[PDB]
Design a binder for this molecule. Sequence first.
Ligand SMILES: Cc1n[nH]c(C)c1Br
Lengths: 353, 13
Amino acid sequence: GHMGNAAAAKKGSEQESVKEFLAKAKEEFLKKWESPSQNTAQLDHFDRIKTLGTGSFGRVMLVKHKETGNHYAMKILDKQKVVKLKQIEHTLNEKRILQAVNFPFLVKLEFSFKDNSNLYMVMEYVPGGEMFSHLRRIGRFSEPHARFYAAQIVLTFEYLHSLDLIYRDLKPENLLIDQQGYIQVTDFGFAKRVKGRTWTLCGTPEYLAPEIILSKGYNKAVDWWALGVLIYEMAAGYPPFFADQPIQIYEKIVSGKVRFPSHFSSDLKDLLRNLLQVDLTKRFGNLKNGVNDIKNHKWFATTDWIAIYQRKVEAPFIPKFKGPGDTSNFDDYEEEEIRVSINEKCGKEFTEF
Amino acid sequence: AGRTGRRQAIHDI
Ligand SMILES: Cc1n[nH]c(C)c1Br
């Protein structure tokens, strides 16, 4: 066969140990899922420094905690802007999931709270910037460097999916580079605990699986499709379904056609054809052997999964860091004052936050 | 041709 006796025994034992790890991680998750934290700080506890990114419902700001001096990333959501029914449910999902998960490649939530106008989530500051801007600046990553980042996503999705969590917004914009060159996934705005199917039309156009676009009930395999899009974009410099307007992107996704740069290795193309698979009975991550079809693929043959988890693999690069609170690895955004109304807004919609 | 800047998520459609 492909593996000799010793290699087959080592892999089987490794796979059993993953099961043991995930069972314990699920017990730890459920304790926190069933007893969330809330109201662990207030706005006046922080000095607001700079906007690190923006979104539909607000911004993420670098803040400095006044008493400790630690820097954090504070996501601010305008409660009124969170107007649509699925916008509201998704924000409750985001906070509840972030407070309960624990994994080396998931950002750590430290505080959450709300006031008359806004919702607030205070996370560890990840100073190396978004993968997005490093990728756009260099053009494309080499296959070994794309593989280093991809392996972290594979392990993170293995963890999340074991907890019945779907992520639903993988993209370089949501992947931050830490001081050791490893990934931190942020933005759980579309993450959801799902036991089987779910039906919300959400995500980012270029990363949507065909079954989302086609208004079908879908499952965690949408995240494996998205991994295919991400790996392709990291290695090519642009995503596989690329067009100026969303409707054109959607038509390309549904077609079942992908073309690859001539510099992609055959191993990479094979992996991508199996992730970017419109037929759910054939998509890697969705078959009998689960995540192992991905982890054991030839393109990952050089990947030491445990060493990646332990953060013992040399990273492709270490961001320059010039002291705490440095924002040099982030783009600039227009600054808008944080106004807190004298009247509580949407109090009933956000009772649980 | 396609989108090179940061991409916003969609809540519908
Ligand atoms: C922790 C975090 N979330 N989003 C950004 C831009 C950071 Br830094």
